[PDB]
Amino acid sequence: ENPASKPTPVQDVQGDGRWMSLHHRFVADSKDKEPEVVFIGDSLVQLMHQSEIWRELFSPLHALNFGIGGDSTQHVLWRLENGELEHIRPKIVVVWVGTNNHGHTAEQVTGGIKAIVQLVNERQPQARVVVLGLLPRGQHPNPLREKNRRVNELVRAALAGHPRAHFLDADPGFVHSDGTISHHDMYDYLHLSRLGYTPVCRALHSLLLRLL
Template identity: 40%
Template sequence: MQYRHLLASTLLAAAGFAQAQDLVILPAPADAWRVTVGHWESQAELKGGGVVAPTPKADYASASHAGASAHVTAGRRDALTFEWRDLWQSMLRVESRSPMDLRPFAGGTLEFDLHVAELDKGGLSVKVGCGSGCERAVNLIDPARGWTGKGWQHVALSMSCFVRDGADFSAVTLPFALEATGSGRVSVANVRIGRAAKPGLACPDYRSESVTPALLNESWSIDWWRPRHEQKLQEKRQLVAAGTPPEVVFIGDSITQGWEKEGREVWQRHFAPLHGLALGFGGDRTENVLWRLQHGEIDGIAPKAVVLMIGTNNTGHRAENPETTAAGIKRLLDEIRQRLPQAQVLLLAVFPRGEKPDDVLRGINQRVNNIIQGYADGRSVHFLDIGAALLQPDGTLSKAVMPDLLHPNERGYEIWQRAMAPTLDKLMGTAR
């Protein structure tokens, strides 16, 4: 029997055609939904009892695994098990075979039962589609790790957690997905979306997320992020104690952290003589940098200049509204000016990402840049866009400069330093 999901007035209940207020995703007939498992490179469809996705081609993922299996009773899938290993991104997706109108459920509740068998080295989020190219996630890493080995747990999330300005719930093909990182194994059952809201299911206001200080809470960051913060506090103290306080401070995400890796030789030539301090943390978004600044990373020093570049993870992680990311950057500028009132701040445009000029995430970054250039006052905050120096004449981004089309290699850091030098030298009073 072929099932169609009719959401205007009549929905399928698990047992057959019946009036229902809920959209029942599990349990469901095996052919009711298209279930896939995979990662950033490929997915495989679950058609029988189990399936394993092809292994990613990259050497670092050669031992990875992403697979799914179904518990089936009388032709119906009662539960799905999702297992992944050594993957920075993997997903279990339950997709509709035709677009559905989820607008009647936008104020309702997503509920499901979750059994966490293993998650000590992994992270877990739940996703719902919100239109073409639009998916929103809720991070479950903290509660899910606490549920490990404790049997089935009931989860209820307000659908408002997945709603953003500009979302289109009129034609959704992804009513439910699990996205995971690291390694883990979970099972999910009794998945449904109800029209009615439930009390006590609050969601953080996504419009203020970028300006609300927070630790970076991802499976791959938990073990090192806070220790790195402590390490940077100690590095700063050592510079001050040696009588060589930093004259320049770089603040940002993994691209700034790269001065300690791919850009190390360039840093040693140009910024080590200035006792430079690199405060770059991989994965950081504006709210994470704000937390670090409020917890001492730039206190007790008086650099001549601060170089700030942040925002590409707001884009990549959340596909965030450019105005929201820009608000986070403005909040950081205010924090820096408060703590380092004598420093000149060089605000860099967010670097281009993606191979082609029409890359969606690059476009978001550019819209962020269009806003934040207005934050420069020409006195203490100065804006510089060196993106053109990183691009080919046709606007493409070369892997010879950014091998993953996001992070510079040594050549990329050389280009960054050369393009920035005239402005930074002037701000530091060292222009020749």
């Protein structure tokens, strides 16, 4: 069926086993901690923890960050089903993944995200789910901008009538009038700089504060 919603771990074709190492760390974190909020997704989530905005806006909320660079929807789904949602009872799970699903249509990526929300609703039914919209990327207009926008429209429409799932477009307007993204916001036109993270995290923090 939909490869975006078929749970699968990242196969190690390099040899150092770092993906499974991260997964195991997160499992241990869930086993030993009692977060009120769990963040899971790709490098947008992962690198948020590395910024000094984390220990500022998010640490006081009692949170765990399970972001892994390069993850697609199916990888996040597999992680959630294989230990990372065990031994905890968070009030909120934040999801940010989908921009890495290369080779999957926007419809498929949307199905991947919906699979993740459904899994969380099953395993942690008391939890509210926040899904962040996929960010634009590339220095100039390109097909991935359109893909990610289309995903955001389909995802938004899917969660509209789901009153415990909240769609948050955290994009302050990275794409300028001339169709460009500034390296000041995204140093490689994909990953957020400290400056690009500010308005993103500000928007997320507000929503988390409202819901909490």
